[PDB]
Amino acid sequence: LPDEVLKAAVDYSVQYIPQRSLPDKAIDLVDVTAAHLAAQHPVTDVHAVEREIETEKDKQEKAVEAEDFEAALNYKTRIAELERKIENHTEDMKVTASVNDVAESVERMTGIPVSQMGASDIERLKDMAHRLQDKVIGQD
Amino acid sequence: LPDEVLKAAVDYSVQYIPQRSLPDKAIDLVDVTAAHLAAQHPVTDVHAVEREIETEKDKQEKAVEAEDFEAALNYKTRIAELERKIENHTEDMKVTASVNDVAESVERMTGIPVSQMGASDIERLKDMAHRLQDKVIGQD
């Protein structure tokens, strides 16, 4: 994660979760952020070809038993093929650390949608005047 | 051995070794005949290449361990090469059954050179008259 996301997580956890110490909460927010950013992606799209590599490896061993070197060489070439394909899929990871994603993580934490996310405490300590004022009637 | 050599061996053992039964002596004469006809030939002329095949086989196993199939294939080809060479040498056996060779086997058995080998008993029973007559003087 780039530093901007990190400082944003700190600034949010400090102002929204005062009931916990800083060092642990800042870490836990990041941790759950990453877990969610896994986006519940599957692994079958590589797992199937892992099975394929296993089968090809077994046939390669069988051919080696019969000392048929051309077939074993072909099998090894196919093994390399599938291997670096899987390598290509593995690096198909999304790298998107956004302050916004941390924000929805917070919202799931506390159930509170935040308008004007990232606003200064200076902003918030004055805006809450209306926040309560506009959910009540008078009695200013 | 062709039948002629066999009957010749029988005819010689019957007339020159009466102090033994027929069936065993006829066999033993043939046996010693063959052993001598081995002519004390060596086996190094194939044994060396047997060692060579052993060394090439070890290198072939080593290359198979490293899964270098071209080298193992070359090694197997060389193994076949040396193998059928050794096959060619193995069939380089002399096939010469001669009544004469049986005769020298007899001579080694009893120390008696035989003039007129294969002569009939009819010949021999009359020729021995001179055989003794000419080694003695008169007294016919």
Tab-separated table of N, CA and C in Angstrom, chain A residues 7-16 99-100 103 113-128 131:
chain	number	residue	atom	x	y	z
A	7	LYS	N	-1.667	6.852	5.737
A	7	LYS	CA	-1.970	8.009	6.564
A	7	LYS	C	-3.465	8.267	6.602
A	8	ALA	N	-4.167	7.980	5.503
A	8	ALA	CA	-5.616	8.130	5.513
A	8	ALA	C	-6.256	7.173	6.507
A	9	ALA	N	-5.775	5.929	6.546
A	9	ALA	CA	-6.304	4.968	7.505
A	9	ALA	C	-6.053	5.434	8.927
A	10	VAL	N	-4.863	5.971	9.179
A	10	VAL	CA	-4.574	6.496	10.506
A	10	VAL	C	-5.541	7.615	10.858
A	11	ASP	N	-5.718	8.568	9.944
A	11	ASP	CA	-6.560	9.721	10.229
A	11	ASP	C	-8.009	9.321	10.428
A	12	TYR	N	-8.445	8.245	9.786
A	12	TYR	CA	-9.823	7.828	9.992
A	12	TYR	C	-9.996	7.055	11.292
A	13	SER	N	-9.087	6.125	11.577
A	13	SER	CA	-9.227	5.338	12.793
A	13	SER	C	-9.073	6.199	14.030
A	14	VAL	N	-8.260	7.255	13.954
A	14	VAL	CA	-8.075	8.097	15.128
A	14	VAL	C	-9.345	8.864	15.458
A	15	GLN	N	-10.082	9.309	14.444
A	15	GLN	CA	-11.244	10.149	14.676
A	15	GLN	C	-12.539	9.370	14.803
A	16	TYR	N	-12.598	8.143	14.300
A	16	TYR	CA	-13.846	7.400	14.338
A	16	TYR	C	-13.868	6.282	15.366
A	99	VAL	N	-8.182	5.495	-0.717
A	99	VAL	CA	-8.774	5.995	0.509
A	99	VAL	C	-10.255	5.658	0.566
A	100	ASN	N	-10.924	5.634	-0.585
A	100	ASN	CA	-12.342	5.315	-0.631
A	100	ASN	C	-12.623	3.913	-0.118
A	103	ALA	N	-12.556	3.744	3.297
A	103	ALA	CA	-13.757	4.378	3.818
A	103	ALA	C	-14.918	3.394	3.901
A	113	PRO	N	-22.415	5.761	7.129
A	113	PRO	CA	-21.928	6.455	5.940
A	113	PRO	C	-21.400	7.819	6.336
A	114	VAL	N	-20.310	8.216	5.696
A	114	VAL	CA	-19.647	9.470	6.010
A	114	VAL	C	-19.755	10.367	4.793
A	115	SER	N	-20.496	11.451	4.930
A	115	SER	CA	-20.357	12.511	3.955
A	115	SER	C	-19.105	13.319	4.274
A	116	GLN	N	-18.512	13.898	3.228
A	116	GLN	CA	-17.296	14.704	3.349
A	116	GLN	C	-16.182	13.917	4.035
A	117	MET	N	-15.904	12.744	3.484
A	117	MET	CA	-14.841	11.899	3.997
A	117	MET	C	-13.499	12.610	3.887
A	118	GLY	N	-12.666	12.450	4.916
A	118	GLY	CA	-11.380	13.106	4.980
A	118	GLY	C	-11.424	14.541	5.458
A	119	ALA	N	-12.599	15.048	5.819
A	119	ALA	CA	-12.708	16.422	6.281
A	119	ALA	C	-11.870	16.623	7.534
A	120	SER	N	-11.364	17.839	7.700
A	120	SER	CA	-10.578	18.141	8.881
A	120	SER	C	-11.456	18.088	10.126
A	121	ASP	N	-10.813	17.823	11.263
A	121	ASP	CA	-11.496	17.993	12.535
A	121	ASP	C	-12.063	19.394	12.664
A	122	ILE	N	-11.361	20.393	12.130
A	122	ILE	CA	-11.874	21.757	12.163
A	122	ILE	C	-13.217	21.821	11.456
A	123	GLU	N	-13.309	21.175	10.295
A	123	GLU	CA	-14.588	21.077	9.608
A	123	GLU	C	-15.619	20.370	10.473
A	124	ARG	N	-15.255	19.204	11.011
A	124	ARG	CA	-16.234	18.332	11.648
A	124	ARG	C	-16.799	18.952	12.916
A	125	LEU	N	-15.941	19.562	13.726
A	125	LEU	CA	-16.374	20.124	14.994
A	125	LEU	C	-17.340	21.281	14.813
A	126	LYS	N	-17.352	21.911	13.644
A	126	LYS	CA	-18.349	22.916	13.325
A	126	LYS	C	-19.553	22.346	12.600
A	127	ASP	N	-19.347	21.326	11.770
A	127	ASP	CA	-20.447	20.763	11.003
A	127	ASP	C	-21.389	19.958	11.880
A	128	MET	N	-20.862	19.305	12.917
A	128	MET	CA	-21.726	18.581	13.836
A	128	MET	C	-22.749	19.497	14.491
A	131	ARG	N	-25.295	19.048	12.154
A	131	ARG	CA	-25.622	17.625	12.111
A	131	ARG	C	-26.644	17.274	13.178
